[PDB]
Design an enzyme around this catalytic site. Structure first.
Site, PDB file in Angstrom:
ATOM      1  N   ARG A  83     -20.783 -43.396 -38.594  1.00 21.24           N
ATOM      2  CA  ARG A  83     -20.652 -43.479 -37.141  1.00 21.24           C
ATOM      3  C   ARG A  83     -20.485 -44.904 -36.583  1.00 21.24           C
ATOM      4  NH1 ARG A  83     -18.511 -39.068 -34.918  1.00 21.24           N
ATOM      5  NH2 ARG A  83     -19.895 -37.242 -34.928  1.00 21.24           N
ATOM      6  N   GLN A  96     -31.290 -40.553 -17.972  1.00 18.64           N
ATOM      7  CA  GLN A  96     -31.094 -41.540 -16.923  1.00 18.64           C
ATOM      8  C   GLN A  96     -32.078 -42.701 -17.053  1.00 18.64           C
ATOM      9  OE1 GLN A  96     -31.563 -39.988 -12.985  1.00 18.64           O
ATOM     10  NE2 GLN A  96     -30.911 -41.886 -11.977  1.00 18.64           N
ATOM     11  N   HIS A 128     -30.733 -46.527 -18.594  1.00 20.01           N
ATOM     12  CA  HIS A 128     -30.667 -47.536 -17.542  1.00 20.01           C
ATOM     13  C   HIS A 128     -31.468 -48.785 -17.889  1.00 20.01           C
ATOM     14  CE1 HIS A 128     -29.145 -45.063 -13.845  1.00 20.01           C
ATOM     15  NE2 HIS A 128     -28.357 -44.957 -14.900  1.00 20.01           N
ATOM     16  N   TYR A 177     -27.022 -29.583 -33.680  1.00 19.92           N
ATOM     17  CA  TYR A 177     -26.990 -29.406 -35.128  1.00 19.92           C
ATOM     18  C   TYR A 177     -28.202 -28.632 -35.619  1.00 19.92           C
ATOM     19  CZ  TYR A 177     -23.519 -33.195 -34.957  1.00 19.92           C
ATOM     20  OH  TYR A 177     -22.428 -33.984 -34.675  1.00 19.92           O
ATOM     21  N   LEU A 219     -18.734 -43.220 -20.140  1.00 23.37           N
ATOM     22  CA  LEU A 219     -18.888 -41.864 -20.663  1.00 23.37           C
ATOM     23  C   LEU A 219     -20.282 -41.294 -20.383  1.00 23.37           C
ATOM     24  CD1 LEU A 219     -20.664 -41.637 -23.615  1.00 23.37           C
ATOM     25  CD2 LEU A 219     -18.636 -42.834 -24.444  1.00 23.37           C
ATOM     26  N   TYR A 220     -21.249 -42.167 -20.130  1.00 26.45           N
ATOM     27  CA  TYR A 220     -22.621 -41.726 -19.908  1.00 26.45           C
ATOM     28  C   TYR A 220     -22.887 -41.354 -18.450  1.00 26.45           C
ATOM     29  CZ  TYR A 220     -26.472 -41.438 -23.245  1.00 26.45           C
ATOM     30  OH  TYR A 220     -27.391 -41.001 -24.173  1.00 26.45           O
ATOM     31  N   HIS A 229     -23.227 -37.089 -14.369  1.00 25.02           N
ATOM     32  CA  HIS A 229     -23.557 -36.542 -13.056  1.00 25.02           C
ATOM     33  C   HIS A 229     -23.655 -35.008 -12.998  1.00 25.02           C
ATOM     34  CE1 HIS A 229     -21.383 -40.463 -11.835  1.00 25.02           C
ATOM     35  NE2 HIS A 229     -22.681 -40.694 -11.914  1.00 25.02           N
ATOM     36  N   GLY A 264     -19.289 -41.161 -28.139  1.00 24.65           N
ATOM     37  CA  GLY A 264     -20.676 -41.434 -27.809  1.00 24.65           C
ATOM     38  C   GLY A 264     -21.564 -41.681 -29.013  1.00 24.65           C
ATOM     39  N   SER A 275     -24.048 -44.892 -29.496  1.00 25.49           N
ATOM     40  CA  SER A 275     -25.485 -44.637 -29.465  1.00 25.49           C
ATOM     41  C   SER A 275     -26.176 -45.087 -30.744  1.00 25.49           C
ATOM     42  CB  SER A 275     -25.762 -43.153 -29.229  1.00 25.49           C
ATOM     43  OG  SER A 275     -25.304 -42.752 -27.950  1.00 25.49           O
TER      44      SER A 275
HETATM   45  C1  COH Z   1     -27.119 -40.357 -17.697  1.00 23.57           C
HETATM   46  C2  COH Z   1     -27.522 -39.571 -16.694  1.00 23.57           C
HETATM   47  C3  COH Z   1     -27.399 -39.976 -15.203  1.00 23.57           C
HETATM   48  C4  COH Z   1     -27.935 -39.275 -14.202  1.00 23.57           C
HETATM   49  C5  COH Z   1     -28.760 -37.981 -14.357  1.00 23.57           C
HETATM   50  C6  COH Z   1     -27.625 -39.940 -12.953  1.00 23.57           C
HETATM   51  C7  COH Z   1     -28.009 -39.529 -11.694  1.00 23.57           C
HETATM   52  C8  COH Z   1     -27.878 -40.252 -10.526  1.00 23.57           C
HETATM   53  C9  COH Z   1     -28.630 -40.041  -9.301  1.00 23.57           C
HETATM   54  C10 COH Z   1     -29.710 -38.934  -9.164  1.00 23.57           C
HETATM   55  C11 COH Z   1     -30.435 -38.702  -8.063  1.00 23.57           C
HETATM   56  C12 COH Z   1     -28.203 -40.950  -8.402  1.00 23.57           C
HETATM   57  C13 COH Z   1     -28.664 -41.168  -6.943  1.00 23.57           C
HETATM   58  C14 COH Z   1     -27.176 -41.752  -9.036  1.00 23.57           C
HETATM   59  C15 COH Z   1     -26.486 -42.794  -8.457  1.00 23.57           C
HETATM   60  C16 COH Z   1     -25.955 -43.856  -9.157  1.00 23.57           C
HETATM   61  N1  COH Z   1     -25.428 -43.780 -10.430  1.00 23.57           N
HETATM   62 CO1  COH Z   1     -26.167 -42.439 -11.859  1.00 23.57          CO
HETATM   63  N2  COH Z   1     -26.874 -41.063 -13.249  1.00 23.57           N
HETATM   64  C17 COH Z   1     -26.710 -41.122 -14.623  1.00 23.57           C
HETATM   65  C18 COH Z   1     -26.012 -42.107 -15.291  1.00 23.57           C
HETATM   66  C19 COH Z   1     -25.438 -43.240 -14.750  1.00 23.57           C
HETATM   67  C20 COH Z   1     -24.849 -44.312 -15.519  1.00 23.57           C
HETATM   68  C21 COH Z   1     -24.747 -44.407 -17.055  1.00 23.57           C
HETATM   69  C22 COH Z   1     -24.358 -45.334 -14.487  1.00 23.57           C
HETATM   70  C23 COH Z   1     -23.643 -46.673 -14.755  1.00 23.57           C
HETATM   71  C24 COH Z   1     -24.527 -47.853 -14.365  1.00 23.57           C
HETATM   72  C25 COH Z   1     -23.632 -48.999 -13.981  1.00 23.57           C
HETATM   73  O1  COH Z   1     -24.036 -50.176 -14.171  1.00 23.57           O
HETATM   74  O2  COH Z   1     -22.502 -48.731 -13.494  1.00 23.57           O
HETATM   75  C26 COH Z   1     -24.690 -44.775 -13.198  1.00 23.57           C
HETATM   76  C27 COH Z   1     -24.420 -45.371 -11.982  1.00 23.57           C
HETATM   77  C28 COH Z   1     -25.005 -45.047 -10.780  1.00 23.57           C
HETATM   78  C29 COH Z   1     -25.278 -45.950  -9.675  1.00 23.57           C
HETATM   79  C30 COH Z   1     -24.963 -47.470  -9.687  1.00 23.57           C
HETATM   80  C31 COH Z   1     -24.062 -47.918  -8.536  1.00 23.57           C
HETATM   81  C32 COH Z   1     -22.726 -47.226  -8.586  1.00 23.57           C
HETATM   82  O3  COH Z   1     -22.046 -47.306  -9.642  1.00 23.57           O
HETATM   83  O4  COH Z   1     -22.336 -46.608  -7.562  1.00 23.57           O
HETATM   84  C33 COH Z   1     -25.861 -45.230  -8.701  1.00 23.57           C
HETATM   85  C34 COH Z   1     -26.355 -45.719  -7.319  1.00 23.57           C
HETATM   86  N3  COH Z   1     -25.324 -43.549 -13.395  1.00 23.57           N
HETATM   87  N4  COH Z   1     -27.004 -41.301 -10.330  1.00 23.57           N
HETATM   88  C1  LIG Z   2     -21.606 -31.776 -42.979  1.00 27.12           C
HETATM   89  C2  LIG Z   2     -22.212 -33.134 -42.878  1.00 27.12           C
HETATM   90  C3  LIG Z   2     -21.320 -34.011 -41.976  1.00 27.12           C
HETATM   91  C4  LIG Z   2     -21.936 -35.399 -41.809  1.00 27.12           C
HETATM   92  C5  LIG Z   2     -22.767 -35.439 -40.507  1.00 27.12           C
HETATM   93  C6  LIG Z   2     -22.310 -36.630 -39.661  1.00 27.12           C
HETATM   94  C7  LIG Z   2     -20.950 -36.331 -39.049  1.00 27.12           C
HETATM   95  C8  LIG Z   2     -19.922 -37.341 -39.563  1.00 27.12           C
HETATM   96  O1  LIG Z   2     -18.739 -37.261 -38.737  1.00 27.12           O
HETATM   97  C9  LIG Z   2     -17.665 -38.031 -39.185  1.00 27.12           C
HETATM   98  O2  LIG Z   2     -17.832 -39.409 -38.660  1.00 27.12           O
HETATM   99  C10 LIG Z   2     -16.648 -40.251 -38.867  1.00 27.12           C
HETATM  100  C11 LIG Z   2     -16.857 -41.582 -38.158  1.00 27.12           C
HETATM  101  O3  LIG Z   2     -17.522 -41.380 -36.955  1.00 27.12           O
HETATM  102  C12 LIG Z   2     -15.386 -39.608 -38.354  1.00 27.12           C
HETATM  103  O4  LIG Z   2     -14.254 -40.436 -38.709  1.00 27.12           O
HETATM  104  C13 LIG Z   2     -15.188 -38.239 -38.919  1.00 27.12           C
HETATM  105  O5  LIG Z   2     -14.062 -37.619 -38.277  1.00 27.12           O
HETATM  106  C14 LIG Z   2     -16.382 -37.377 -38.727  1.00 27.12           C
HETATM  107  O6  LIG Z   2     -16.181 -36.148 -39.468  1.00 27.12           O
HETATM  108  C1  LIG Z   3     -26.069 -37.440 -34.478  1.00 22.87           C
HETATM  109  C2  LIG Z   3     -24.795 -36.918 -33.850  1.00 22.87           C
HETATM  110  C3  LIG Z   3     -23.602 -37.347 -34.677  1.00 22.87           C
HETATM  111  O1  LIG Z   3     -22.518 -36.711 -34.597  1.00 22.87           O
HETATM  112  O2  LIG Z   3     -23.695 -38.336 -35.449  1.00 22.87           O
HETATM  113  C4  LIG Z   3     -24.683 -37.440 -32.432  1.00 22.87           C
HETATM  114  C5  LIG Z   3     -25.130 -38.714 -32.112  1.00 22.87           C
HETATM  115  C6  LIG Z   3     -25.032 -39.183 -30.810  1.00 22.87           C
HETATM  116  C7  LIG Z   3     -24.479 -38.383 -29.821  1.00 22.87           C
HETATM  117  C8  LIG Z   3     -24.382 -38.870 -28.524  1.00 22.87           C
HETATM  118  C9  LIG Z   3     -23.209 -38.725 -27.796  1.00 22.87           C
HETATM  119  C10 LIG Z   3     -23.122 -39.215 -26.502  1.00 22.87           C
HETATM  120  C11 LIG Z   3     -24.208 -39.860 -25.931  1.00 22.87           C
HETATM  121  C12 LIG Z   3     -25.380 -40.012 -26.656  1.00 22.87           C
HETATM  122  C13 LIG Z   3     -25.466 -39.518 -27.950  1.00 22.87           C
HETATM  123  C14 LIG Z   3     -24.031 -37.109 -30.145  1.00 22.87           C
HETATM  124  F1  LIG Z   3     -23.493 -36.314 -29.214  1.00 22.87           F
HETATM  125  C15 LIG Z   3     -24.136 -36.641 -31.444  1.00 22.87           C
END
Ligand code: COH
Ligand SMILES: CCCCCCCCO[C@@H]1O[C@H](CO)[C@@H](O)[C@H](O)[C@H]1O
Ligand SMILES: C[C@H](C(=O)O)c1ccc(-c2ccccc2)c(F)c1
Ligand code: COH
Ligand SMILES: *[C@@H]1O[C@H](CO)[C@@H](O[C@@H]2O[C@H](CO)[C@@H](O[C@@H]3O[C@H](CO)[C@@H](O)[C@H](O)[C@@H]3O)[C@H](O)[C@H]2NC(C)=O)[C@H](O)[C@H]1NC(C)=O
Ligand SMILES: *[C@@H]1O[C@H](CO)[C@@H](O[C@@H]2O[C@H](CO)[C@@H](O)[C@H](O)[C@H]2NC(C)=O)[C@H](O)[C@H]1NC(C)=O
Ligand SMILES: CCCCCCCCO[C@@H]1O[C@H](CO)[C@@H](O)[C@H](O)[C@H]1O
Ligand SMILES: C[C@H](C(=O)O)c1ccc(-c2ccccc2)c(F)c1
Ligand SMILES: *[C@@H]1O[C@H](CO)[C@@H](O)[C@H](O)[C@H]1NC(C)=O
Ligand SMILES: *[C@@H]1O[C@H](CO)[C@@H](O)[C@H](O)[C@H]1NC(C)=O
Ligand SMILES: *[C@@H]1O[C@H](CO)[C@@H](O)[C@H](O)[C@H]1NC(C)=O
Ligand SMILES: *[C@@H]1O[C@H](CO)[C@@H](O)[C@H](O)[C@H]1NC(C)=O
Lengths: 551, 552
Positions: free
Chosen positions: B89, B172, B176, B324, B353-354, B357, B495, B499
């Site tokens: 990964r 979240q 953050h 899994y 990607l994170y 919302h 992701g 991660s």
């Molecule tokens: C991962 C889950 C998640 C959740 C549940 C969530 C839920 C919520 C939430 C719930 C009440 C509120 C009020 C907001 C509002 C915001 N989100 Co998020 N956010 C989330 C992930 C993120 C991420 C990742 C960013 C990027 C931070 C950045 O620096 O741009 C983000 C950016 C923001 C920002 C930074 C300013 C902007 O880019 O406009 C605000 C404000 N937000 N979000």
């Molecule tokens: C059945 C066991 C599978 C191994 C579990 C982890 C999944 C691995 O996933 C692999 O990771 C590589 C790099 O991210 C990718 O290039 C491959 O497409 C992907 O199959």
């Molecule tokens: C362990 C597994 C993997 O395929 O290696 C794996 C690992 C990480 C993520 C992951 C993807 C998006 C945000 C945070 C975590 C995920 F969705 C799946």
């Protein structure tokens, strides 16, 4: 007092207090077990049974010149040997870094705070009965007495290896990009947050400084032309802050990346040479990439020069001071199939061991003059009068002093040498023998074993009383040198890991960076891989004077 | 214009201009060669054939439970499987980092400046004819249209994978600490200079902020006791700057490591939980080490909590969202005989990607109450009135929304979702298919292949015209999800590298750190290696309620 003052844990074992008067040694992955990590495992026994001493290794590398001449001409064998060198050495360095002057235990503050010099050994605890732990007297001997008895120079002792002033000034210029003590905070703090070879002594530490030094045309640095000769710009012109005595005229206040390079003409020589080299590389890149803007030309030139520097440091600088008949090679590809961390953190101990004050001569001989220290310092008009060509020619042929062997620190800089002792104590350094054990070296059993003679050994014995409390820094300067060499065993076996780790740990040595496209194509790539101290001078100094680090 | 605007270099090949209208591809160690790095070497050609698609691997991992049940109980197999994951990964991630929003070529500025988010793909050159390079129209479709037509929620769509509010608020809160965009400079900049799991959202980014949050006794953090319950201290008491409206009562202005965690009581829940956990670990360490001082008690507790976090994030958090049947394991030793860089730089794309919302529900259901967004924001009185115990019970039971699949973004956060598209364009992101190729995925040959349906695919076709210029962020939210899953292929395959890189790339996972002595002996070490989301709640929440990232 702290239960770990006596340093009970051996063989890289971690010590931890488990109560007010008890300890516990973490022997994890040390190859040893037991209360003090002293009982070797079976494989460990075999390894220590075959591991040759550094002295025997140094002997082989410095003898059989004919055999080595054969090896150097076998690309496979040359790569094989150099690979082992680049792997085994930095293995002795904690990476990610661990301790610093404030943290004898691992913490997030120690790791994350780049303002600290890291520490190869943790500091002695504050509440320890003796300065070194439990051994020795209540106080260390007067640093002045240690200074005057075995460090200060009587007759000038020239380096038998033949190191010249080009070497001495290169060392000072090169190392002062990552040795920048933040004295506002203390000796254990640095101003060089890059912690390595980023060439900030040319381009500046902060982005504001860099932008004041830049011309923003063709990626070049600002400069002035005096008598047809390209020199650094002035403080008045760039508004770049430099450290100069108030009596220094405005025109002679050159502005360079390092705030202190104005104080020594030898440093300013290299500062001018490297500034010329940067702008030379910009010219080359511009006719390779006429489409490129100013920013990319500058940035690409910086990476090439960083690569140039590492190239020169290994194949010229380190090649010379090692004395090996083997031909060192700068090739990042050797590490691609090995486990290696491409990062670095400058160790306080690396800084202390690099205080090569005995390297300095009594006078600086240029052309037909013999400038004293008082005449030389702050005096950049000397550089303009003779010129760079005379400087290179003169410094190429003027010999440097021996670093080890005792009694070769010039009186002119005695205050600096005393400070290296005092600040080592201030930072609570552990004893010489602790650092030797830390780097897989056998401890010295007597002072005579350390110096290799009787006179100085007796002087130290009356000062320290015990070899186990001998301080690290004065030991490096009085150590018995290798046969006709500039350094002793401790100096090399400590400096070599620190050095190679800092050089190879650079991100441009990583496989995602080590590509022709990183350096603007194959042309810019070949600049790095064909760089040398001679070519650096030949390209940028009028007349192409011959130069090296010997004679 | 720039001769690399069309992105002609394939398979991780690097593009470089050689003239005003000529380019060169660097095919170094790509496994390919030729002008565009497209001709495969013999070994590479074999690897491609034998390589199973990510969807194929996903099927195996989410099926044959009887076989995984055996695998999970054979420590050698489990480790071997986990060892492959931890090596395959992060290999897609540049480490040491390379590009950022300002540099599409490698430079020392991009490497050394920790204020930047790094970039997995270089930004599109400024002088390119179209926003995505050469393909597509002169302008990307209106961001609001894309938002309203295929992103905004019509009816609430529950996550079929069963994620609850405990999961969403953990996501979240946890992310953050390294997603702290510095809007004073731009979206390509961050305030989290640690670029990973350092728990600055608990302890503070700077030393100055940390020392205002610390009690400087027994290594503990400052706190207050309200109605017998332990909560974070106030802004007034610590002089810690927090983001609060002026009308918020003094006692309800809780001060924690992250300035924005007062925004929502779900974040303050975890902040309170982690505050108690730190002082709990302090108590344990003070017992083991009566000789230790305040500073060592604090620093060691921090390292332990960092360990707990990485432990929980892997074996509970990532384990849940993965789906899994294989049981993931947090064991740093698996990389000791492998090539791995213990360093990390937060990518801007990881951030984008994170933006999960859609996870957010229409209302936040605590006990018998159903609070709306307006009622929930900046309202810590809800946390006090109900208490942490009712919070955990309620949030464990409330379902979360599906992230992929399209049309599940709450209208209350439409402005945030729109900003994600606008900022991605300001940072000049490359297209979806460019990021798919970058991470060894096959490019989508149509919008219907992307969504797996027709209504949203048709709308996207009229908006973008070309599938090769479809944007990254909106594609992640409309992508055809895996069977009964929360994400699509692109979310996971991008992701997971990011991660796992940041998780294992922590210094405490390095051989010199991964020792009992580092965490104060065997006791501190055991706290880490047995930590779980259930243990976290059990130890620090009154009554020890059952909790989980899944509703079940
Ligand atoms: C991962 C889950 C998640 C959740 C549940 C969530 C839920 C919520 C939430 C719930 C009440 C509120 C009020 C907001 C509002 C915001 N989100 Co998020 N956010 C989330 C992930 C993120 C991420 C990742 C960013 C990027 C931070 C950045 O620096 O741009 C983000 C950016 C923001 C920002 C930074 C300013 C902007 O880019 O406009 C605000 C404000 N937000 N979000
Ligand atoms: C059945 C066991 C599978 C191994 C579990 C982890 C999944 C691995 O996933 C692999 O990771 C590589 C790099 O991210 C990718 O290039 C491959 O497409 C992907 O199959
Ligand atoms: C362990 C597994 C993997 O395929 O290696 C794996 C690992 C990480 C993520 C992951 C993807 C998006 C945000 C945070 C975590 C995920 F969705 C799946
Ligand atoms: C390696 C060769 C070398 C040379 C040729 C050299 C030549 C000279 C020289 C005139 C030529 C003078 C006046 C000095 C004087 C000094 N040296 Co050096 N030094 C050298 C190696 C070093 C190193 C390495 C440091 C560490 C810098 C730092 O910030 O600690 C140092 C530090 C210093 C300091 C700062 C005090 C301290 O931090 O301990 C002074 C003053 N000195 N040195
Ligand atoms: C990392 O990169 C950012 C962005 O390039 C750097 O911030 C920038 O800093 C420069 C100077 O420090 C600012 O430039 C300007 O300088 C003039 C001086 O004449 C001044 O008048 C302007 O007001 C401004 O300060 C630039 O605006 C600023 N940019 C941002 C987005 O903050 C940062 O310094 C870099 N980090 C490091 C450690 O160098
Ligand atoms: C790294 O450590 C140094 C020293 O501990 C920190 O500098 C201190 O900062 C605090 C708060 O800003 C001041 O009260 C002290 O006076 C400073 N001490 C010194 C010796 O300068 C520095 O802030 C730390 N670095 C970071 C990034 O937090
Ligand atoms: C709740 C917010 C909805 C805003 C929709 C305004 C834009 C219109 O969007 C339309 O909505 C229809 C039903 O959802 C779909 O059938 C169409 O595909 C879509 O274009
Ligand atoms: C090449 C040789 C070696 O033992 O590998 C060697 C020898 C000496 C050094 C060295 C360099 C600077 C200060 C002290 C020692 C070094 F960095 C490398
Ligand atoms: C360990 O070291 C301590 C002090 O250095 C010593 O008293 C003790 O006898 C040693 N034990 C062993 C087994 O070597
Ligand atoms: C500086 O050097 C010049 C020679 O170029 C000399 O004449 C002058 O006296 C020196 N200045 C000092 C203060 O030593
Ligand atoms: C490389 O790509 C360009 C445009 O992407 C294309 O015109 C050219 O034919 C390609 N060359 C080869 C050898 O595939
Ligand atoms: C905050 O929550 C309380 C319930 O604890 C509620 O009564 C109050 O109206 C809320 N405040 C706002 C401004 O919605």
């Amino acid at each position: 007092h702290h239960p770990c003052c006596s340093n009970p844990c051996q063989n890289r074992g971690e010590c931890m207090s488990t109560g007010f008067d008890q300890y516990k040694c973490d022997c994890t992955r040390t190859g040893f077990y037991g209360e003090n990590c002293t009982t070797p495992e079976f494989l460990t026994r075999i390894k220590l049974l075959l591991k040759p001493t550094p002295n025997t290794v140094h002997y082989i590398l410095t003898h059989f010149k004919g055999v080595w001449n054969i090896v150097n001409n076998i690309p496979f064998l040359r790569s094989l040997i150099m690979k082992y060198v680049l792997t085994s050495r930095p293995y002795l360095i904690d990476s990610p870094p661990t301790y610093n002057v404030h943290y004898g235990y691992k913490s997030w503050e120690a790791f994350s705070n780049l303002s600290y010099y890291t520490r190869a050994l943790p500091p002695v605890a504050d509440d320890c009965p003796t300065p070194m732990g439990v051994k020795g007297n209540k106080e260390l001997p007067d640093s002045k007495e240690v200074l005057e008895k075995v460090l200060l120079r009587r007759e000038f002792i020239p380096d038998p290896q033949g190191s010249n002033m080009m070497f001495a000034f290169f060392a000072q210029h090169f190392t002062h990009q990552f040795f920048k003590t933040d004295h506002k905070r203390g000796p254990g703090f640095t101003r060089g947050l890059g912690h390595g070879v980023d060439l900030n002594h040319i381009y500046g530490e902060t982005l504001d400084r860099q932008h004041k030094l830049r011309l923003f045309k063709d990626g070049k640095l600002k400069y002035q032309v005096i008598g047809g000769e390209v020199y650094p710009p002035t403080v008045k012109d760039t508004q770049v802050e430099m450290i100069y005595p108030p009596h220094i005229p405005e025109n002679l206040q050159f502005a360079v990346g390092q705030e202190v390079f104005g104080l020594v003409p030898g440093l300013m020589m290299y500062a001018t040479i490297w500034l010329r080299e940067h702008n030379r590389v910009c010219d080359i890149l511009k006719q390779e990439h006429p489409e490129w803007g100013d920013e990319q030309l500058f940035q690409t030139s910086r990476l090439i020069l960083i690569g140039e520097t590492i190239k020169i440091v290994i194949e010229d600088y380190v090649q010379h001071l090692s004395g090996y008949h083997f031909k060192l090679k700068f090739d990042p590809e050797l590490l691609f199939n090995q486990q290696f961390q491409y990062q670095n953190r400058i160790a306080s101990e690396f800084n202390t061991l690099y205080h090569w004050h005995p390297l300095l001569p009594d006078t600086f001989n240029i052309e037909d003059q013999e400038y004293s220290f008082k005449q030389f310092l702050y005096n950049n008009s000397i550089l303009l009068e003779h010129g760079l060509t005379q400087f290179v020619e003169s410094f190429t042929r003027q010999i440097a002093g021996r670093v080890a062997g005792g009694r070769n620190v010039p009186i002119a800089v005695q205050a600096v040498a005393k400070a290296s002792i005092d600040q080592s104590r201030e930072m609570k350094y552990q004893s010489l023998n602790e650092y030797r054990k830390r780097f897989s070296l056998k401890p010295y059993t007597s002072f005579e074993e350390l110096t290799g003679e009787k006179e100085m050994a007796a002087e130290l014995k009356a000062l320290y009383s015990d070899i186990d409390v001998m301080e690290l820094y004065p030991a490096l300067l009085v150590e018995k040198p290798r046969p006709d060499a500039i350094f002793g065993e401790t100096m090399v076996e400590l400096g070599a890991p620190f050095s190679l780790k800092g050089l190879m740990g650079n991100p441009i040595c990583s496989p995602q960076y080590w590509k022709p496209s990183t350096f603007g194509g194959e042309v810019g790539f070949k600049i790095i891989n064909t760089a040398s101290i001679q070519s650096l001078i030949c390209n940028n100094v009028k007349g192409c004077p011959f130069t090296s680090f010997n004679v």
